[PDB]
Each structure stands twice: as C-alpha cells, then as structure tokens.
Paper text:
Conjugative type IV secretion systems (T4SS) mediate bacterial conjugation, a process that enables the unidirectional exchange of genetic materials between a donor and a recipient bacterial cell. Previously, we solved the cryo-electron microscopy (cryo-EM) structure of a conjugative T4SS. In this article, based on additional data, we present a more complete T4SS cryo-EM structure than that published earlier.
Thus, only three TrwG/VirB8 periplasmic domains (TrwG/VirB8peri) in the asymmetric unit (18 total) could be located unambiguously. However, density was observed on the side of the TrwG/VirB8peri ring, a density that could not be interpreted at the time. Additional data collection has, however, resulted here in improved density in this region, allowing us to ascribe it unambiguously to a fourth TrwG/VirB8peri domain. In the hook, one molecule of TrwG/VirB8peri could be fitted based on secondary structures (region number 5, right-most panel). The newly observed MolD makes only very few contacts with this trimeric unit and is not related by symmetry with any of the other 3 subunits. However, it appears stabilised (and therefore visible in the density) mostly via interactions of its connector sequence (between TrwG/VirB8peri and TrwG/VirB8tail, residues 63 to 94) with the corresponding connector sequences of the other three subunits. Because of the twofold symmetrical arrangement of MolB and MolC, their TrwE/VirB10Arches-binding sites are located in opposite faces of the Arches ring, one facing outwards and the other inwards.
Numbering used by the authors:
A (entry chain F), C (entry chain E), D (entry chain D): 63 to 231
B (entry chain H): 86 to 103
E (entry chain I): 83 to 101
F (entry chain G): 63 to 228
Write the structure that this text describes.
C-alpha cells in the first residue's frame, strides 16, 4: 500500500473560501497581439483617477496590469503625508478620460487624456491635459480567479510616465 | 516565468473621514 | 497509481448556497472560457450597479455589450416615474460585485453576484444575493473609436434574466 | 472505472468547522433549511421557467435535480404538439420567481412562487400565483464533471406537483 | 455579412438636476 | 479490488484549530510540523482518557498508533487488580484535553495536557496537569480496512512517558 498522500485544507472564516493545500492546476496559453493595448488603456484610466469609494479596485487593477517596478511607483503615490489617500481622501476626487491612443512601435504607445478634480463642496477645478507614454508587454493568462477576471490577457506596463500637455494652439 | 503576483493596496481599509 | 480526490462542497450557513471548492484545480478550458467570464462580470456589474456620477459610462457600456432587444430592456429601467434615475437619482447608489461565473454550454453562463444600496445619509441597506443567467455571443470588433476602446471583442448579450433569492434570499 | 465516491467536506460559514463524507448519500444528503430552500428554489424556478435561449441548461439542470420518475414527467412537457418547445418556442417566454419556501417534515417542503408570460410583440400577460409541493432527498455527490459543477450536493426531487394559488384575500 | 452591431437607445447619462 | 487514500484534515485559518476527519490526517511516514501535533494530541487524549462506554475504540486506536513495545505498556494498564477496567470500571471516568504540543527534533515532541476524574455520584476531582514526552515515527499506510480508517498516515509511538507537571 502506498502511504495515503498527505491531505490538508485551509478554510477562510471570513469568506468561507475553502482551498486545498496541494498546488493548483495550470491553464490555457495562446499569444494575441492586440491584448497589451486594451489592458494598458484600462490600467491608465484606473491609475490616474481617484475615488475613495472605488479606488480599491482601481488600485489593485493598476497593480495587476503593472510590472513590479511600475507597481511600486504606483503604490508610493498613496504613501506619506502627501498620499493621494490623505490629499484627496474623501474630500476630493479625480475624474480621468482618454481621448486617443496611438501605438508607436514594439511594446510602446502614446496616450492622450484629460483629468479634473471635483469635491465635497460641489466645485470643479479647471480640467488639465496630459500625455502618457507607456512601455508594455503581456505575460499571458494569470493563474488566480482574482486576476483572470480582471486581466486575462496578461497586460503589463513595464515603464510609465505622464507629463502635462502644453496647449500651444 | 509569467510570475503573476502582487502585494497590492489595502482596498477595503479606508480611513476615518474627519 | 494516480488517484483523484473530490472538490469539497462549501455550505454558506447564512444562504444555504453550496459552493464547490476546487481540488488543486485552476484549469482554464479554452479561449473565451475565462475571457467570457470577464465579459459576463463586467456586463453584470455595470448593468446592475448605479452611481449618478459614473452611470453614463456604465449605461453606454451596457448598451455596447447588449443586443438591441437587451439594450431596450435595459434602457427602460431608466424610464417612467420608477426610473433608476428618479428612485436612486443622486440620493442613493448601488454597489455590485461578482463572486463567481461558470459557463454552461453554447453561448450561456451563470453569474453569482451580490448587490447593496448606500445613500446620502451615510446608511447602508443589507446586501442581497442574486443570480444572473446570460445568453451571449460575440459580433466581432466594432468600427468606431468610441466602441472599440470599450468592447473590442464584440461581446454581446442576447438574453438576460437575473433573479433575487425569495424573502431573505 | 468507478472511483472514490465524491466527498463533500461541508464547511460551516459561521465557525469554519469542516465535515466529511457521510451516510447522507443513503439518506437526505441535502441538510439544513437554508440549504434545502436553495435547492427547492432553484429547482422550481428552472423547472417552471422557459426561455428558448437558456432552456437547455435549465432543462438539464432540472433533470440533474430529479429522480428518473420526475425527470420523465418533466421531459414529457416538451413532447407532442402542445410541447413547451412549440407553444412558447421562440415567440413567448416564462419568467419565474420564488417568494418563500418553508420545509414541513422529512424530505418535504412547500414553495410559494409566481409566474408570468412575456412575448415577441413586447406584451406581458397578467402574473399568476402557484404553490409547489416537493418531495425530496439527496443522493450524494455525482461522479461526472458535468454533474458536480451543477448539483454537488446531490439534490433530488422524488415527487412534484404545483397547483394554482387561489388569492382569497 | 455579420450585421454584428450594437443597439440604439436613449442616452446613458442624463442630467442629475436638484429639486 | 481497489484501495483507499486519506480524506481531508481541518486547519482553521483564523484560529489555527486542527480537526481530524474519520480518515486520520497522514503524517507522510515522517514526524512532520502539524502531523506530530494532531497525532500526538489524539494519541495522548485517547491513551490517558477513560470511559467504559467508548474505551474499546480508544484502546484499539492507541494500540494502532503504538509500536508493540508501547502497545504492551498500554495493555498492561488494564491488567491485574489495579486495572483501569476495575479501578474506574463503570463507576468513574477520566477526561483528557491537550493544551499545547511543540515538536523538538527528529521523531520527538512535548505534549502539555490536563486530566480530571468524574464519577457516578456526580462529583468531580480536582484537575491535574501532566506533560508527555513522545518518541515517534510513521510506518506508512496500513493494509486493513479496520486500520486505515483510524490511522492512514501510519503514526506510531516508539517511546512514551508522562509525568505530573509541577
């Protein structure tokens, strides 16, 4: 008789989620060229934007669509006394919309977008114009339900910057 | 490889709105 | 020698809902097997949710991901004296989150999700549990910038019916 | 070819306690008002409801949750010139919702529910009220992926009837 | 050949006027 | 004919509490990190405890989880005029609970536990505190239905002692 394989399970008392100790199963794998751009556009809108009420999803989504280097740059925006969480907090919010995106090469695209600040006193600040440069790739499908239902394509930002647009019109 | 992973932001833990 | 164990069943003590805890299984069956769950999630969340401040995008997105028959059913929810726009308006809001989606056939899937109402007085209503049945297809890439940047895949709901639990649920 | 019978490690949502396979296979495997009312609801809704677009899943699910005697009674509703498939076909649809379920004994419960007919001309028939009496047991976990992902508990109807409710109010 | 296109319906966002 | 594997072991993520299903959690024929904890607990509790009504299972289980040397030491506790079967018999009972187990090496662990005596007159003796030292190994899965449904992991005590705690 081979020794009964060790059997162990963990039960989350808060979510009632039951998970086997043994390593999980691998998934499907195919390469799609037009997957990085869609993930990058969704990540950019969640990243620059802010709302106390929805930010946890935008925050995790941005990280899900970011290389660890990029994730850290992003996480840091919520740190210290000047943290978005303290500056905007639940007193002010940021609305972001993308006007146009045009790929320019081998894992690189230009995103033209706007942003504006709204607040608890019912006022709105003048909108600003910004342009992001995104370096990106795809890492294929993720192997967790919490990731595949947000970024199935594997979009990942490897480099990111966004500068003010100067409206020399 | 793909190495999907994160140590993401506390989403649920919002602070005391003053 | 290889032997297979069983996914344990998790019974929610509050809802009596039985969830299958997968045994070392994270397998994805095919292109759109998990991609479909993304679209089904985003569809239900945006369709069922409401916030005066973001609804224009969720509204247009829902229509973008709906067959004309479905679009009309949806549009009608914002009509008349009992319109979501008048009932919730800017006094109350709906938060929606999907727990699990499992495809079951040829253009059909089951979406298990929850919903709750928040309001201007800072109160929150008890959360409800609901299950949506979605009939769907894909119509391929759209040919407008305002559509491709929201639904590039062409996801389209052809039939939709979400039923809440009876009494408590 | 027959393998270890599927074992449900029932997890308590309040305490996180883990149960094991039991003699419930040779008894009523479904246990707890909360759990039984769920199965009774899903059974009635799927059995009584109809939509050309989703019925294949509701049809197979109903059979999956029915004793062969019951399955045959159900299958027959789709037979002959008066078949639901010909009467409703893709011209009319049935919407079903359960209001309340209360167990009353040893494999028996009462389901109070409503039903209404919608159609292709955009009209809706007046809703009707009905009450189902369900005799039931549980046969334990099934041993096919196509069954366990729909009825892991083994719910099975052994007797079924539903009569019009007379609203003597 | 597809005819695969989205529906047409009243606007998704409408004014949230106060009262 | 087919043979059976282990079923499941409960490990509450919030409380760290360990619950054993009828199929005993396997120790993988090794002392383990939690394998020693659950088996060491069940061994001490069943070995030290006594109830006329359930002892046949605890007795056989203890033997199932014991090396022949250990089994004999245990069997002897039920022999002679001072036998547990005559002293406690169906007049008094022993309740045992383990407070904490900490492995300390290569087939060895320390078990901190308590014990108390209850009886037919409805009285209870003051609880005592004891510490067991257990030497152990695993012999792999057993090949009898009556053994695999009790000790699938093959837990086996090779040395045992328990002294009063001061």
């Amino acid at each position: 008789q081979p020794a009964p394989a060790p059997l162990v399970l963990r039960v989350d008392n808060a979510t009632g989620a039951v998970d086997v100790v043994t390593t999980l199963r691998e998934h499907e794998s195919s390469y799609g060229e037009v997957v990085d751009t869609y993930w990058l556009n969704q990540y950019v809108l969640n990243r620059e934007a802010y709302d106390y009420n929805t930010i946890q999803m935008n925050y995790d989504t941005t990280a899900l669509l970011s290389a660890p280097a990029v994730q850290q740059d992003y996480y840091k925006l919520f740190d210290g006394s000047n943290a978005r969480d303290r500056v905007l907090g639940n007193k002010a919010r940021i609305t972001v919309r993308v006007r146009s995106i045009q790929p320019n090469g081998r894992g690189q695209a230009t995103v033209r977008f706007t942003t504006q600040q709204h607040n608890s006193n019912g006022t709105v600040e003048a909108p600003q114009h910004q342009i992001a440069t995104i370096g990106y790739t795809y890492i294929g499908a993720p192997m967790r339900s919490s990731d595949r239902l947000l970024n199935p394509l594997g979009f990942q930002v490897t480099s990111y910057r966004a500068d003010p647009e100067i409206l020399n019109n | 490889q793909v190495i999907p992973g994160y140590t993401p932001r506390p989403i649920r833990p919002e602070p005391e709105n003053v």
